[PDB]
Curated annotation (Swiss-Prot), chains A, B:
Presence of keyword Transmembrane helix: yes
Domain of life where this protein originates: Eukaryota
Chain's gene name: DPP4
Outcome (variant: H711E): Inhibits strongly homodimerization, dipeptidyl peptidase activity, interaction with CARD11 and T-cell costimulation activity
Annotated InterPro entries: AB_hydrolase_fold, Pept_S9_AS, Peptidase_S9_cat, Peptidase_S9B_N, Serine_Prot_S9B/DPPIV
Reaction(s) catalysed by this chain's protein: Release of an N-terminal dipeptide, Xaa-Yaa-|-Zaa-, from a polypeptide, preferentially when Yaa is Pro, provided Zaa is neither Pro nor hydroxyproline
Protein name as catalogued: Dipeptidyl peptidase 4
Extracellular side: 1-727
Record PTM: The soluble form (Dipeptidyl peptidase 4 soluble form also named SDPP) derives from the membrane form (Dipeptidyl peptidase 4 membrane form also named MDPP) by proteolytic processing. N- and O-Glycosylated.
Glycan attachment sites: N46, N53, N111, N180, N190, N242, N282, N481, N646
Disulfide bonds: C289-C300, C346-C355, C405-C408, C415-C433, C610-C723
Family: Belongs to the peptidase S9B family. DPPIV subfamily.
Amino acid sequence: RKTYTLTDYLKNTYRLKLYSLRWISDHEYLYKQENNILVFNAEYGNSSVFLENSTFDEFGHSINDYSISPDGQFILLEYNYVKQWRHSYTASYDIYDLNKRQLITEERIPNNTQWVTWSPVGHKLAYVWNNDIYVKIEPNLPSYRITWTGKEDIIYNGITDWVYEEEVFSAYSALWWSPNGTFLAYAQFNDTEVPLIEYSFYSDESLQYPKTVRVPYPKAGAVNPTVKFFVVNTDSLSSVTNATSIQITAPASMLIGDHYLCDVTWATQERISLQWLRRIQNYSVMDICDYDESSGRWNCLVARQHIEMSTTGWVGRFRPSEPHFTLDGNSFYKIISNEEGYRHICYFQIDKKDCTFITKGTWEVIGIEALTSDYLYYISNEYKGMPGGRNLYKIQLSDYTKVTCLSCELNPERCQYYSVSFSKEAKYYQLRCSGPGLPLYTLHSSVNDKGLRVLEDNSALDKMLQNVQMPSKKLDFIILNETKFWYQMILPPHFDKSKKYPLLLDVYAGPCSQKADTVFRLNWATYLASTENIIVASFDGRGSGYQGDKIMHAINRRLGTFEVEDQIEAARQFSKMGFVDNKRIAIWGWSYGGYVTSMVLGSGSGVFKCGIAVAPVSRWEYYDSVYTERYMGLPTPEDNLDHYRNSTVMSRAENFKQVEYLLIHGTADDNVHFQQSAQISKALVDVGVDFQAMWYTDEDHGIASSTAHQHIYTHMSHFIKQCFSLP
Amino acid sequence: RKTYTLTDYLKNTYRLKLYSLRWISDHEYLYKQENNILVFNAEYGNSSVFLENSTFDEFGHSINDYSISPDGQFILLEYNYVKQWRHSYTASYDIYDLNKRQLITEERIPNNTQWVTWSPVGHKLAYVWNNDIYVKIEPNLPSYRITWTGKEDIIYNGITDWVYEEEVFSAYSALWWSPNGTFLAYAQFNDTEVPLIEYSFYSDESLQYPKTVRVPYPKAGAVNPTVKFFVVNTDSLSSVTNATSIQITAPASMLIGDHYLCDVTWATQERISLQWLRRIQNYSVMDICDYDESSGRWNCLVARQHIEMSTTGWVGRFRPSEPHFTLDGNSFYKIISNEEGYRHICYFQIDKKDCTFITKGTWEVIGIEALTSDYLYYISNEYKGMPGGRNLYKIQLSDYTKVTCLSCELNPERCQYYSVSFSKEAKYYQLRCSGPGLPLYTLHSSVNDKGLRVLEDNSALDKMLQNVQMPSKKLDFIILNETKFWYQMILPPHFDKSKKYPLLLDVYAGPCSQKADTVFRLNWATYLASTENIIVASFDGRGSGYQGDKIMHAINRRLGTFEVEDQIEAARQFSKMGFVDNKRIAIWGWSYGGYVTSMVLGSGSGVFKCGIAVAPVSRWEYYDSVYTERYMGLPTPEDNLDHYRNSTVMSRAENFKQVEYLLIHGTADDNVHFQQSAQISKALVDVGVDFQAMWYTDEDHGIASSTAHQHIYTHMSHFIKQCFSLP
Ligand SMILES: *[C@@H]1O[C@H](CO)[C@@H](O[C@H]2O[C@H](CO)[C@@H](O)[C@H](O[C@H]3O[C@H](CO)[C@@H](O)[C@H](O[C@H]4O[C@H](CO)[C@@H](O)[C@H](O)[C@@H]4O)[C@@H]3O)[C@@H]2O)[C@H](O)[C@H]1NC(C)=O
Ligand SMILES: COc1cc2ccc3c(c2cc1OC)C[C@H](N)[C@@H](c1cc(F)c(F)cc1F)O3
Ligand SMILES: COc1cc2ccc3c(c2cc1OC)C[C@H](N)[C@@H](c1cc(F)c(F)cc1F)O3
Ligand SMILES: *[C@@H]1O[C@H](CO)[C@@H](O)[C@H](O)[C@H]1NC(C)=O
Ligand SMILES: *[C@@H]1O[C@H](CO)[C@@H](O)[C@H](O)[C@H]1NC(C)=O
């Protein structure tokens, strides 16, 4: 009667094999084996030992990562890694000649380097150190210093500040090489007048006085960072005179007030597109700027400026979507919310603004994965009208009726959720099936869409799981006000619909979220279902993503309303089904899910006996501007201050009398500050409500260190088991 | 009947009734009788309404406290109270002329005044504002500024810094008037090179960004603040020239290193005594200083210098004890530990180094309360060989073998714990019996020690607690290594010895602590006994006070050792008594007790099932220098770093697998910094131990606010009840 135990989750008893490859050419890619890096050919199989783990003994330092130059001559080695935020870090760097089999000692990249990157061809290097940009034409040669204004916590050249990193670019870098690698474009960020979040960091017990960390962080309605865009020619660099960065100022549409740079895409060698976004994020502008060799400057022609605005809510999913440009750069494809509010691919001519929708229907495109002369490849949730499914498609650019699903019917029962990685000029691709069956990895040729070989099919894990009492999984929908709203249920083994099980509602419910999908996972819910016989439910109600704006923009300016009501309403529908002990219905959630969980418990519905909130938002004025304001607008009397104040967890404190609550938070959360939880604890105390609590010293929003991760789930497991009266 | 519930404690259902009086003369005292301030004739009771409960009805502000001058002409009104640390605060101040029943409104005391005080006679005013001293001769007239070097968190003129406030003077003021009010003595602290503790304060929900509080706090081994002492003549204050402050420099044996000013006591109109302590607190020095009217300076004769030291530990109980000077100022009485190791009254002549012990034996003098021409009055625990008891005594100065107890037999069954307050010339005195019966307040005449009248006897409360199933106290002792160690037990009503009971150990166990005593308390323990049938015990092991240096100095340089070991042994002893359920032995504590509870739970003794630790110290290097170093010395290689490192809670993390642990701490604890608990959790998480936790937002070391107080005792009750399997 072996089951998926808590320990199995915490101690990776049942590993899940991936197949991460790195496309180096159109024909080849790299893969890790024995710790060695092996280059493969796509068509034949043609293996060859590119690099060997034996190479880097006597190097002294442990190698965290690497990066092979485009041309193939050099490899970057990344050590002394030190994590900062979600994507940001610092690390020491060294270069290895590969062809000479020699490590380079000449003019080495500085220690504590913030970011580094090769050009897309050849072997130029750009790196950021002390918030300044440096360029190295050759590894061995001295670097050319581009920026001289870098300054910790104020001026950021070629790297992002906290809020851009987190909410805009999903990256620490703010550099963009042109394709042939001659121009390097970069953004500069200025946080002078941005207020600082302050919190304690305690460190090893040997540290006597706690450190006070100070991070520039704009909260809702605060002073935001200002941005400037620059381009510099990397060929015409002088070793004698300072480099000259040409500015590309934002368009007058943006300069009237607060705005952001949101997307940067090169079209050609002489052409670059810049999407901007007003601080009120319903209005966006894309300039298409061309280099002229006459004046040495850049020109964004007004006749190529594309405006994009939404009247129901915000622009894009989390931002304006990226443009994929054609060969000549005189036209581009780009996902746009259509007339019926469903996101689809729109074909633009650069000097004709009204695009043509090459796709349509009651479904959305997730992303444009590859563009060729004749075909555009994209991922969508079209197959079987299932919003939580993902498949690869291609549309013939010369006739839009020629839509071919390349992944729908490969293993229909085993695969309904695909992601894709193409080769450099898109001749091949790798298909990643992440569920509902065991994940499956296969390589393909884009010429005739032939299944070349299976890279990894997780048959080892399959042998192991055959013996285990695994939970099943049910994906389905309910109808509310005519609309289908989907849910998923991790059901226990030997599921008996006449019996009555306790239910845990797994919640996120943030703007454009999707918890109801066909993905295969081995997580906490697996354990709860397998060992403790708990149904783990997830529901996607109003505000959720990938089903059109009808649903998604329902919460516009109204966070802590419809998405809360629907999670409550979902649980009510789960009792109706007659296999749920309605005396043992619980809720839980991390982050936004913690806010919704908190607000749900504060609603006073009585449906939920107990709830857990991990690193929850409490009041939208405590969280950052770029995220909060995209949905809530500005917290002013003239805009939406009232709902800001009306949607706090604190104000509902009285209603936690009837529930059991567990409030968990990391003390060094730089994202959802411990502040947030501090005000929840303080409100509950003031209305005399008892509740359990837990801080995690020096843990951040992830609470992901092996020890902390194990401790929190063990604590939450205990709390749920006792709430459900289980041994 | 009904029981003493947790509601009774928290809501304060059964109040005791005090009798707080201020002796204004040799034969009169003031009493606040339902806001009407009366003045009583001590000899009879002839009382007249000194000031109406009305008077200040159209003031508009709420009066926090009041202070009437010695001459009776003026009354100081305190309002806008804003608590800082244990003693410190700021307030607004308005003066009121009693003769003319009108309010002074010119040259008023500024707002945010840090301290104010009358001269001991007349109506002069010294006050502190922005860390600078001011003097007003007349309430209406402009103040004179004394100090100009005051600077927030750097220089403190006339007021203590953090550490002196908490660890030396138990007061915010560092201002001492001469008896007639001619000279104003003042200390000055320089916290420049003293590091800062920093922590978040989140404040009202409205506050968008938390405030980092930054307090000068020297942790163990850090840079201490320096001190300088001065005197100034208030009678000769010039409004043209800035005032002259004559400095009294510390003795040379102090100036060779770090040191503290630990006592200031005026002996006569022109004579002031100082006491200095080395940073290594086993060496004190007293200088008696006389005014020289010809040069206008202060000289302390090396003839009148008195060295006070120790080989077994540290000087005095918490600091060098205060001297009570004779009228002429040519001698004084002072509590000192003797040959045997017991603290008794020694008689010093100011110009002779050796004193004579006027009392002796295996008991200790707690304090010297009065001095007349032929009798010295003192409180001690000599009666019935009970360290926990307190009684008033007098000793004939012409014959030390004639010793009369004043309070011993007044009511032996009811009263074993007295304090006293004498009239201006010890003609009358108020005796205050704190237990074991209900507290009793009586007035007496020192001429013959005649009882005059019962002032308060708590009859009202006596009638209330007849319909309440009250517990019963049991003060007793066990023997360890042939030495008696006292303990108490709060026992549930209907105490059946043949049954077995759950045991909670209330612990403090700090140096010179006393938890086993004769006082009557209506506290949390009263509810655990009366309602839940829990035996709540406390035990004064090694390190405990009022039983000699054999016991109190047993933990010198060795905190975390015996006082821990002894609480365990005490629990082993109680489990061997037949009426104690050894399956259900709990332990708890606040502060030092929290440190001890933690050390005990991580001891691996296997005696305690569960325990609660509240605002615990975790590592002595985190706690302040003045306290910690008294009992540990410096945390250095040359001194005692080895034990500083050996005596952490975190070193004992592994052993918490055997116990249910609740850790509690407030986020604005300026004293034992949240850090300390933060380091415990991290250790428990690092080794994978489960434990419950609870933080209290913006609460300090007291966790005293109405709602925070109610919530923690509520929270701790559940923890104990469920640990003991009680409904
Ligand atoms: C990042 O952003 C910073 C502002 O957010 C910017 O710093 C400028 O702004 C600061 C405000 O923080 C200004 O103090 C300063 O400009 C002004 O400085 C003086 C005020 O203290 C003011 O007297 C100056 O005006 C004078 O001089 C100018 C010509 O230089 C004349 O126009 C005026 O008539 C007058 O004579 C001046 O206006 C800062 O420049 C940072 O520079 C920015 N960093 C970037 C973009 O890298
Ligand atoms: C598609 O790209 C994105 C998806 C995203 C999905 C969730 C998402 C973000 C995303 C940011 C993205 O790009 C910058 C950023 C938020 N800080 C994050 C987030 C949201 C919260 F409400 C919260 F309390 C903490 C968080 F870390 O949620
Ligand atoms: C006799 O007077 C005193 C008694 C005292 C009794 C306990 C006492 C103090 C005292 C200070 C005194 O005067 C300076 C000061 C300490 N900071 C306090 C104290 C000790 C601790 F171990 C701790 F963790 C927190 C504290 F606030 O304990
Ligand atoms: C370039 O500009 C910076 C401005 O900070 C200056 O300090 C540096 O000397 C200049 N170098 C050259 C080569 O002009
Ligand atoms: C306080 O100390 C510093 C050196 O630590 C000194 O420079 C400063 O002048 C001092 N101030 C006073 C008022 O003593």
